[PDB]
Amino acid sequence: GVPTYGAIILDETLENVLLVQGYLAKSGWGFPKGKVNKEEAPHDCAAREVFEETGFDIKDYICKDDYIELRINDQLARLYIIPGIPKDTKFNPKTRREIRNIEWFSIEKLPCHRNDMTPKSKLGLAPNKFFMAIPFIRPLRDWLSRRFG
Ligand SMILES: COc1ccc(C(=O)N2CCCCCC2)cc1
Numbered sequence: 183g184v185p186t187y188g189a190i191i192l193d194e195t196l197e198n199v200l201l202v203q204g205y206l207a208k209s210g211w212g213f214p215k216g217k218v219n220k221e222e223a224p225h226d227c228a229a230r231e232v233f234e235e236t237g238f239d240i241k242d243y244i245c246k247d248d249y250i251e252l253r254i255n256d257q258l259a260r261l262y263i264i265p266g267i268p269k270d271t272k273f274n275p276k277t278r279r280e281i282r283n284i285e286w287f288s289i290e291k292l293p294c295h296r297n298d299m300t301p302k303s304k305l306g307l308a309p310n311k312f313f314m315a316i317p318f319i320r321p322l323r324d325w326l327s328r329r330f331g
Pocket residue numbers: 186202203204205208211212213214215216217280314
């Protein structure tokens with residue numbers, strides 16, 4: 183996998199995070215992110231994908247050591263943490279061919295794992311519209327507890 187870069191944007195209260203909704207195979211809700219171009223530095227990729235998908239430019243707010251990174255089936259995804267963005271910010275994606283909707287979600291209400299179907303004696307996981315975000319939720323909560331209490 184070519185690495186992906188993006189951001190976890192929080193509001194002023196630190197209660198809420200900004201998610202985006204795509205289409206088709208990406209039809210659920212996730213953190214904004216995308217694939218790095220040849221020769222493009224990580225911070226530049228994160229800013230460009232977040233600006234294409236949200237309309238908001240994070241370049242002046244990125245902190246180099248403040249991010250959460252995960253490897254999932256051999257693709258690396260790194261999300262820079264960006265606190266303190268006002269809830270009344272006007273977000274407007276660039277390509278509406280990729281992004282259906284943009285919303286704020288309460289962190290404490292988001293799932294941190296999918297649910298089994300052991301009520302039905304059936305293997306696997308039940309569908310969840312937050313599937314792209316879920317892996318980052320527990321590591322975010324733990325990062326926030328350490329930096330802020
Ligand atoms: C393999 O390349 C990828 C690139 C980006 C994403 C991703 O999460 N996106 C893109 C748009 C859909 C909505 C959520 C944000 C996933 C995979």
